[PDB]
């Protein structure tokens, strides 16, 4: 992990890069012959939005994401990680990875609405005024189609649109 430090000492600017010790991979994966990091740790079709401990591994401290060339993931599972990180961020998980702006925390707004399993964004969804009957129903999506491939212990499919 490399950090940059910018120093101002009397009309002289010094920009330096310093290496900080980084954590390493755990020594014994259960499936060593797998290429991809999730698919060698056997977390394919297992994790969800609730798994905070794995979604914290592939994120920036400011809530951003890391590219797939760095993370090494397969493309579909990288998209699944991206969707689950977005779902957790709108669900109110990862509270310490928001950026710090001390002028803005003091002017409080209306209290944060508790929500989870949000496929879309709060600001871009129109309210369904017209709705519909049973033979044409506008269904509110809950969860994402990227996560329909998870295992079902009940055996019933995950109802994504309700």
């Amino acid at each position: 992990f490399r950090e940059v430090v910018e120093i101002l000492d009397g009309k002289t600017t010094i920009i330096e890069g310093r290496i900080t010790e980084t954590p390493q991979e755990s020594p014994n994966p259960p499936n060593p012959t797998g290429q991809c990091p999730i698919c060698r740790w056997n977390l394919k079709h297992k994790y969800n939005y609730e798994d905070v401990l794995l979604l914290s591994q592939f994120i920036r401290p400011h809530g951003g994401m890391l590219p797939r060339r760095i993370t090494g993931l397969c493309q579909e599972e990288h998209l699944k990680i991206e969707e689950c990180v977005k779902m957790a961020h709108r669900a109110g998980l990862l509270p310490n990875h928001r950026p710090k702006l001390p002028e803005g925390f003091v002017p409080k707004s209306k209290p944060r609405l508790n929500r989870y399993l949000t496929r879309w964004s709060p600001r871009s969804v129109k309210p369904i005024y017209n709705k519909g009957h049973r033979w044409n129903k506008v269904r509110m999506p809950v969860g994402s189609p990227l996560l329909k491939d998870n295992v079902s212990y009940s055996g019933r499919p995950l109802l994504l649109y309700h």
């Binding site: 797998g34 290429q35 991809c36 698919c39 394919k44």
Partner: protein, 38 residues
């Protein structure tokens, strides 16, 4: 009563709709994904 060939897609009988639904194509799904196979 409509003709045999129309332009309005000719909405089907319910038993034929059940026939279409049971005889939809399903792809072969391998046991382990070949991309993150070795």
């Amino acid at each position: 009563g409509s003709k045999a060939v129309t332009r309005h897609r000719r909405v089907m009988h319910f038993e034929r709709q059940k026939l279409m639904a049971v005889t939809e194509y399903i792809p072969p799904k391998p046991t382990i994904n070949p991309r993150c196979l070795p």
